[PDB]
Design a protein around this ligand. Structure first.
Ligand SMILES: CC(=O)N[C@@H]1[C@@H](O)[C@H](O[C@@H]2O[C@H](CO)[C@H](O)[C@H](O[C@]3(C(=O)O)C[C@H](O)[C@@H](NC(C)=O)[C@H]([C@H](O)[C@H](O)CO)O3)[C@H]2O)[C@@H](CO)O[C@H]1O
Ligand code: NA
Ligand code: NA
Length: 205
């Protein structure tokens, strides 16, 4: 065996305040994989160093024959809970490498090129919480006057938004302004906005 185990990963996007779960498929021509390590480029062959500390991983049934074939690939779970204080800007990504060893000691090669992304090399992209959610079209709340929404009227718009969006975090704050504009403030303090014309109407015309 002169061929190392091959890896197919993916575009791993994660969000602040949310759990994530991705899987990579590892195959080898020997049909067996004895070890899987996910790590930073820096370090020696033996380096297991992986940052950020909240990125966890596990692989079941390691070191067993036929655990990494084309018909039934070895699966590696890449999971964790992104903290709320993680930094996001526009270059908020960590390029990491998946290294697996077959019984011969052959290890997946780490090549520093963007054309390998989604194979042994993957990009973990950390985004704000708001990017995970796309607010659904909620039921229209008919109000008395579009300039002048009352406190109960604004409470009814928040609730309608909540009714049409059950997936949004229970602790996310939905607030409505005097003219009906909706602001969803997630646990990490990012925000989405819904224009008033999509959620409130009156019969003043
Ligand atoms: C200490 C040292 O010498 N290490 C170098 C390492 O710096 C150097 O560059 C790293 O190469 C990898 C590719 O293997 C990436 O290109 C790293 O760049 C980026 C990344 O993609 O990960 C950009 C991103 O903008 C940065 N993220 C944030 C949030 O800032 C990350 C991030 O700094 C690191 O991931 C943190 O661990 O870096 C790049 O830095 C490589 C080869 O270029 O050589 C090692 O010896
Ligand atoms: Na092999
Ligand atoms: Na969004």
């Amino acid at each position: 065996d002169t061929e190392a185990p091959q890896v197919k990963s993916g575009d791993y996007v994660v969000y602040r305040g949310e759990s994530f779960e991705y899987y990579a498929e590892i195959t080898d021509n020997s049909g067996q994989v004895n070890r899987v390590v996910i790590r930073n480029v820096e370090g020696g062959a033996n380096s297991t160093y992986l940052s950020p500390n909240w990125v966890k991983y596990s692989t079941e049934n390691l070191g067993r024959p036929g655990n990494a074939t084309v018909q039934n690939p070895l699966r590696t779970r890449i999971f964790g809970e992104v903290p709320l204080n993680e930094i996001v800007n526009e270059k908020s990504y960590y390029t990491r490498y998946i290294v697996a060893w077959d019984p011969s000691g052959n290890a997946t090669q780490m090549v520093d090129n963007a054309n390998r992304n989604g194979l042994e090399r993957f990009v973990l992209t950390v985004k704000s919480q708001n990017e995970k959610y796309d607010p659904a079209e909620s039921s229209v709340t008919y109000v008395n006057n579009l300039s002048n929404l009352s406190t109960s009227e604004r409470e009814a718009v928040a609730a309608a938004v909540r009714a049409a969006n059950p997936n949004i975090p229970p602790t996310a704050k939905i607030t409505v302004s005097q003219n009906g504009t909706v602001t969803i403030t997630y646990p990490d303090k990012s925000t989405d906005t819904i224009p008033a014309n999509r959620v409130v109407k009156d019969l003043q015309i």
